[PDB]
């Protein structure tokens, strides 16, 4: 999990800047707020 930095936050906000409310969400949430969901995908755990 990566706590998004100020620069990272700017990136996300700019990605969704065209849509006002999209950018709003990101921008309103404080920097080091938006966290990165780097969920693991590898298995190993077989299933039962």
């Amino acid at each position: 999990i990566i706590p998004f930095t100020a620069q990272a936050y700017e990136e996300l906000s700019r990605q969704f800047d065209p849509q006002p409310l999209a950018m709003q969400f990101i921008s309103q949430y404080s920097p080091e707020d938006i966290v990165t969901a780097q969920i693991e995908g590898s298995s190993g755990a077989l299933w039962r």
Binding site: S42, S43, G44, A45
Partner: protein, 141 residues
């Protein structure tokens, strides 16, 4: 551990210069009937695994194929923990002065007895019956 990442874990202990996060989370879930807001008192006692250290070289051979390596984890099993009704398994300082070097010498033994049948016994540096029953203490509040 997923096979590609198991081989990567291997590699780390084998060579890969990285520090495996050995978070020894000591979660202490109590109850709420007798009170205890965040009953679960937890603390990840992490041991950054120095790349190919004595412990990690034992782990290299552990994950190579042999199952007879007593991985020396420098005193990292809190034998006295002042846990309260909050979410923290903080050990008592002075009870364990170093409290990272005065916890309790813990050992690890992966028992891959192909028949890999990878088991994992948590031993002690001085395991008497603490390979199956490690006796620490939680100073409860």
């Amino acid at each position: 551990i997923s096979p590609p990442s198991r081989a990567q874990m291997k590699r780390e202990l084998y060579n890969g210069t990285a520090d495996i996060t050995l978070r020894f989370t000591w979660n202490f879930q109590r109850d709420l009937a007798k009170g205890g807001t965040v009953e679960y008192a937890n603390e990840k006692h992490m041991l950054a695994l120095a790349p190919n250290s004595t412990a990690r070289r034992q782990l290299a051979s552990l994950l190579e194929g042999t199952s007879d390596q007593s991985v020396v984890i420098p005193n990292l099993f809190p034998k006295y923990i002042r846990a309260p009704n909050g979410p923290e398994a903080n050990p008592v300082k002075q009870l364990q002065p170093n409290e990272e070097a005065d916890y309790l010498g813990v050992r690890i033994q992966l028992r891959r007895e192909q028949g890999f049948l990878e088991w994992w016994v948590i031993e002690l540096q001085e395991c008497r019956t603490d390979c199956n029953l490690l006796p620490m203490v939680i100073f409860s509040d």
